[PDB]
Design a protein around this ligand. Structure first.
Ligand SMILES: Nc1ncnc2c1ncn2[C@@H]1O[C@H](COP(=O)(O)OP(=O)(O)OP(=O)(O)O)[C@@H](O)[C@H]1O
Ligand SMILES: Nc1ncnc2c1ncn2[C@@H]1O[C@H](COP(=O)(O)OP(=O)(O)O)[C@@H](O)[C@H]1O
Ligand SMILES: Nc1ncnc2c1ncn2[C@@H]1O[C@H](COP(=O)(O)OP(=O)(O)O)[C@@H](O)[C@H]1O
Ligand SMILES: [Mg+2]
Ligand SMILES: [Mg+2]
Ligand SMILES: [Mg+2]
Lengths: 370, 379, 372, 24
């Protein structure tokens, strides 16, 4: 098939869909399904029952939210199927699914059944001509245009570090932890409860996530900032009321680097990055320090680069160059890399044909990846 | 060493007394009667300017220390029971009131859930506190409160009082007695908090699991034909002397169903424990499931515990919890004190431990030197 | 007669007992657990750090650290805590009253043994002590004086050939692949299967799964094909919660890393190739005897069918005429300790102690002159 | 640069490279 492939970066928090030709993901929206909060049986209420994309943002107060993906693993497969069908809607891509081949993106070290069921859904419910599932860490280097680097993809659900040297991936050096943007949002909810502000509702999870996106910075010296009197930045709720966030602004994201404060048994973003570098072979390590590529939304935290540089400096060997290449487009780097990959003619030899899936069965999608 | 006093402040009621006592000496509404204003002001208020809160706490603690506890404040230590994730500003204001003004030796800001655990003698359980403002679940495992697996919902006594007021104002039938022996709905614009609280505690009750589910289904009544259970008889609650509010039978069992109603979000009082438990470490689940402790004034409503346990066992079988928490044996604890003052009883047990209480508590010299109260937030 | 203690500080599991006994008195995991939460108030009956089985029972809240990694003590405070628990709490004996016969793997850092001796003589004030090679003790336990011991425990797998009591230091071959590496690989393949285990507490659950279910396949490809084409090999395990999880081919892929380190990413020989290379490094005259007296030791050699697989692999590698005989006693998990007890029960061993007088005279470095 | 101007989450007013000082 010579039609333009469709690239669908499958985020835990925000999915990004588009065509491979485009330089940017033309379509992108949160990865959740919004249902009416009350069990509607009367007429005149929010009809349809399934609000996805900006529609869910229009009436966000009245909806109960449910994410299908958690920690990069699909939980509600019906909701994920609804999401993917909505990607092929009149609102997004205005096209039939049977025409275009598809490139998915999946987190590394995920369950095999997740990928198997995703392929089954994309080949059975949608009559797609072909499919290919890539890791986002491989795609970030495609997007940046470099052949080597350590990709630290800190998405909404999963935070993983992957070193690649000259296009060779180190499967045993990959590091992965579940402390990511959603966990930072949960900790921010807890700290805002400590401020005296309640966000119990699932819908209110969205506005505490908005507070995380708007006003939350990583302090190089958290003790000094805590001792220093905070400015108590004011934030506007959707309804109209103001809130003073206070010191929680710098306490919630701090758990990404030091999760053990809240008792979480996790390595921390700097720890997984450094250990992914160190587990690799020794001769590569210096170059792996000289090419660090950030990716994912959680890397967009204010002052994240400086704190990560400080941590890597104090953990790395002395007098070793470090280059945390943090492109401004790091939120959509994974999709841009997927588009660049799908543009290549080599992609023609990578995706599995529908007849190939029918004949070889499930194991094809496992073996053609590597 | 003199016996340390114990204070447990709450929106609805404050429990006060001495350590090493079988129960609190004093339990009163957390209000202060300022001159000139008919309805008194709530002492414990969050998100207010610190001067007003300081004055309120000063007056209330003075009332506690010179009306109910007949003893000087300077002599004896304090064991203040404050719930986990209590608002910070209220906490440092309370400690500042205790230190700067009263000059107590030291205040121990104990957590309510761990203290409630101490009363039973066990060292691990899933403590649910159904307070006035909100219900809160916290697991404790070997004296370590697992803050990571906390849970909370705003289904305490405040929401219940609001629901009662709404239902009464809808199905209002009050005999004014002044040429109004017939029903005269909503003669008064708003029912005071005291009347709602008395109606809730005296008349209302928590129905059985099956009856509650049938009531919830019949609320929608989609193609239903008298599927509701037969309600209890109506009760004629006297108001203000002459007035007689005919509290309907249906309200008495339907008002409290908001605690256990799911409403397309899978969030209720019962589901809260399961949600917290499913987040716990893999090894801690069983010991936390077999040890359940319920505290708080709302839990004292008649038939609450039976409905809660039945709803827990019912929701366990649902597909969300079937895989993980399916084969589990939940069991409720029966602490020696009434559920109003289990946390206070824990604080009282901790108070008589004179040797450790000096080291654990924060000395006034330390507070004067630093002015920073310890907290589980970053320092 | 004052009995001398024998303390096998394994990388994973610490064993301890009195000389002359048949089995160790105390056998507990060598872990130090610490509470995870810091900010919140701590309950009444608590310890700053838990050790041994106490940490294992309370592992749900604690975070565990192994003091010994790859047979090298990395945290000496934790190892000191482990020894204190071993002597005072478990054995319930004063360390100053008895000698102690510790054990160490071959080819370890010299500083490890030096610090071991220093800690034993200064902190605990034992009247004497000794450090012994684990393989030599395990050969003592089997009632042999000629043979090749492939002792594989939680941290390291070392092969030592011995002939008529004369060790051959230049033919010893050490590998860092053992135990913990297999547990981590089991975690990885379990994550591919669907069950995610990340915390240190879950490492104990994965270790228990490895102990209970895993086995060595005589033919790896045939068993893989059987697993693919049928569910006969699937077996169910119950977690402490009560969740039931099914393990399929992963039963015989976790221990297969012993014979194929390429699964773990290390470009090292398998245990069969390591044993064959160690035999071939020996002189030509004694090799036959070693082929007839291959001894398995350590806890990680307890997989079902490992003896048959090792016999098959060595027979394939070795010449046809030589007779291979892998000796795998049922109690081999404690064979490193038992021989140590024998070595402590001998009358001729009273001259092999490092007396405290000699330690004061020469310092810790005497451990390199006396022990080995 | 302007090709990413329309996207919501493009974080601007920050440097694209956080690196240690060069040493000869
Ligand atoms: N004996 C009782 N029987 C029934 N309900 C009661 C009883 N005592 C108090 N309540 C109700 O319980 C609620 C108060 O609970 P509780 O006294 O535990 O809260 P609190 O400590 O004041 O508040 P919070 O913990 O939120 O700070 C109110 O609804 C009150 O009406
Ligand atoms: N400026 C920002 N500050 C803080 N967090 C942000 C910012 N922008 C995005 N995020 C977070 O990043 C997450 C999106 O991650 P994403 O890149 O979608 O991960 P994935 O690889 O799963 O697609 C969101 O949940 C959001 O909370
Ligand atoms: N019955 C068994 N089956 C499989 N593996 C076992 C068995 N018993 C113990 N092990 C493994 O052996 C290891 C312990 O080995 P051990 O003899 O204690 O070595 P060391 O003495 O160096 O600690 C554990 O990590 C465990 O996984
Ligand atoms: Mg992504
Ligand atoms: Mg209470
Ligand atoms: Mg051993």
């Amino acid at each position: 098939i010579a039609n333009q492939p469709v690239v669908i970066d499958n985020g835990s928090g925000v999915i990004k869909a588009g065509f491979a030709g485009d330089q940017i993901p033309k379509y992108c929206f949160p990865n959740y399904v919004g249902r009416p909060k009350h069990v509607r049986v009367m007429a005149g209420a929010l009809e349809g029952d399934i609000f996805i994309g900006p529609k869910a943002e229009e009436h966000r107060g009245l909806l109960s939210i449910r994410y299908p993906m958690e920690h990069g693993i699909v939980k509600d497969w019906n909701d994920m199927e609804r999401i993917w069908q909505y990607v092929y809607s009149k609102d997004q891509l205005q096209t039939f699914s049977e025409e275009h081949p598809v490139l998915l993106t999946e987190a590394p070290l995920n369950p095999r059944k997740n990928r198997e069921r995703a392929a089954e859904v994309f080949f059975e419910t949608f009559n797609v001509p072909a499919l290919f599932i890539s890791m986002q860490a491989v795609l970030s280097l495609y997007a940046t245009g470099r052949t080597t680097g350590v990709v630290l993809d800190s998405g909404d659900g999963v935070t993983h570090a992957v070193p690649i040297y000259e296009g060779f991936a180190m499967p045993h050096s990959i590091m992965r932890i579940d402390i990511a943007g959603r966990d930072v949002s949960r900790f921010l909810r807890l700290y805002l409860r400590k401020e005296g502000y309640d966000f119990h509702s699932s819908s209110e999870f969205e506005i505490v996530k908005a507070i995380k996106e708007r006003a939350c910075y990583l302090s190089i010296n958290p003790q000094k900032d805590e001792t220093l009197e905070t400015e108590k930045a004011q934030y506007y709720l959707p309804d109209g009321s103001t809130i003073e966030i206070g010191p929680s602004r710098f306490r919630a994201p701090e758990l990404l680097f030091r999760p053990d404060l809240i008792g979480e048994e996790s390595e921390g973003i700097h720890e997984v990055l450094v250990f992914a570098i160190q587990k690799s072979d020794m001769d590569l390590r210096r170059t792996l320090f000289s090419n660090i590529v950030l990716s994912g939304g959680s890397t967009l935290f204010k002052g994240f680069g400086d704190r990560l540089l400080s941590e890597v400096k104090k953990l790395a060997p002395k007098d070793v160059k470090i280059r945390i290449s943090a492109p401004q487009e790091r939120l959509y780097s994974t999709w841009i890399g997927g588009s660049i990959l799908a543009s290549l003619d080599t992609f023609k030899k990578m995706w599995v044909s529908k007849k190939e899936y029918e004949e070889d069965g499930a194991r094809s999608i496992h073996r053609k990846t590597f | 060493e003199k016996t340390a006093v114990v204070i447990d402040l709450g929106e609805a009621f404050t429990k006060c007394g001495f350590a090493g006592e079988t129960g609190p000496r004093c339990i009163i509404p957390s209000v202060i009667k300022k001159a000139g204003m008919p309805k008194p002001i709530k002492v414990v208020q969050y998100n207010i300017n610190t001067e007003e809160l300081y004055s309120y706490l000063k007056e209330f603690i003075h009332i506690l220390y010179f009306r109910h506890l007949l003893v000087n404040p300077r002599d004896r230590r304090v064991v203040v029971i404050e719930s986990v994730l209590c608002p910070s500003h209220f906490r440092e204001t309370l400690t500042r009131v205790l230190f700067k003004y009263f000059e107590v030796p030291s205040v121990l800001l104990a957590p309510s859930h761990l203290m409630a655990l101490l009363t039973l003698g066990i060292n691990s359980a899933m403590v649910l506190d159904c307070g006035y403002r909100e219900s809160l679940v916290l697991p404790i495992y070997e004296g370590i409160p697992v803050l990571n697996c906390w849970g909370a919902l705003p289904l305490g006594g405040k929401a219940l009082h609001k629901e009662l007021e709404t239902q009464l104002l809808e199905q209002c039938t009050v005999d004014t007695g002044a040429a109004k022996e017939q029903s005269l709905p909503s003669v008064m614009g708003s029912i005071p908090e005291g009347v709602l609280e008395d109606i809730k505690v005296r008349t209302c009750f928590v129905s059985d699991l099956t009856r509650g589910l049938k009531i919830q289904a019949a609320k929608f009544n989609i193609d239903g034909n008298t599927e509701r259970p037969s309600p209890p008889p109506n009760v004629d609650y006297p108001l203000d002397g002459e007035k007689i509010l005919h509290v309907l039978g249906s309200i008495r069992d339907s008002v409290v169903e908001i605690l256990f109603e799911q409403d397309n979000e899978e969030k209720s009082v019962a589901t809260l424990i399961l949600d917290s438990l499913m987040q716990c470490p893999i090894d801690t689940r069983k010991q936390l499931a077999e040890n359940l402790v319920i505290i708080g004034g709302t839990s004292m409503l008649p038939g609450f515990l039976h409905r809660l346990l039945a709803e827990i066992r019912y929701l366990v079988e649902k597909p969300k919890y079937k895989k993980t928490l399916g084969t589990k044996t939940f069991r409720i604890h029966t602490p020696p004190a009434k559920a109003n003052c289990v946390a206070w009883l824990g604080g009282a047990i901790f108070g008589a431990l004179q040797d450790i209480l000096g080291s654990r508590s924060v000395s006034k010299e330390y507070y004067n030197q630093t002015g920073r109260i310890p907290d589980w937030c970053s320092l | 007669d004052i009995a001398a203690l024998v303390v096998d500080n394994g990388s994973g599991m610490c064993k301890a007992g009195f000389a002359g006994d048949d089995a160790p008195r105390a056998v507990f995991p060598s872990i130090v657990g610490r509470p995870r939460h810091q900010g919140v108030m701590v309950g009444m009956g608590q310890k700053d750090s838990y050790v041994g089985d106490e940490a294992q029972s309370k592992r749900g809240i604690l975070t565990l650290k192994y003091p010994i990694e790859h047979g090298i003590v990395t945290n000496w405070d934790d190892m000191e805590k482990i020894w204190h628990h071993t002597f005072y709490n478990e054995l319930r004996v004063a360390p100053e009253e008895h000698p102690v016969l510790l054990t160490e793997a071959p080819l370890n850092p010299k500083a490890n043994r030096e610090k071991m001796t220093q800690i034993m003589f200064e902190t605990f004030n034992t009247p004497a002590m000794y450090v012994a090679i684990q393989a030599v003790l395990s050969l003592y336990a089997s009632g042999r004086t000629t043979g090749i011991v492939m002792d594989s425990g939680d941290g390291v797998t070392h092969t030592v050939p011995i002939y008529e009591g004369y060790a051959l230091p230049h033919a010893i071959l050490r590998l860092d692949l053992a135990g913990r590496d297999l547990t981590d690989y089991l975690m990885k393949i379990l994550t591919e299967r669907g069950y995610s285990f990340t915390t240190t507490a879950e490492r104990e659950i994965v270790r228990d799964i490895k102990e209970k279910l895993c086995y060595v396949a005589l033919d790896f490809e045939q068993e893989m094909a059987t697993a693919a084409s049928s569910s006969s090999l699937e077996k169910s395990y119950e977690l402490p919660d009560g969740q039931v999880i099914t393990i399929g081919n992963e039963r015989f892929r976790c221990p297969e890393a012993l014979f194929q380190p390429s699964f773990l990413g290390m470009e090292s020989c398998g245990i069969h190739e390591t044993t064959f290379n160690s035999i071939m490094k020996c002189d030509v005259d004694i090799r036959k005897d070693l082929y007839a007296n291959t001894v398995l030791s350590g806890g990680t050699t307890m997989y079902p069918g490992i003896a048959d697989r090792m016999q098959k692999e060595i027979t394939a590698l070795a010449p046809s005429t030589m007779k291979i005989k892998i000796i795998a006693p049922p109690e081999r998990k404690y064979s490193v300790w038992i021989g140590g007890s024998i070595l402590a029960s001998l009358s001729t061993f009273q001259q092999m102690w490092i007396s405290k007088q000699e330690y004061d005279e020469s310092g810790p470095s005497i451990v390199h002159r006396k022990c080995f | 640069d302007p090709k990413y101007a329309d996207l919501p989450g493009i974080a601007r007013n920050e440097p694209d490279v956080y690196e240690t000082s060069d040493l000869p």
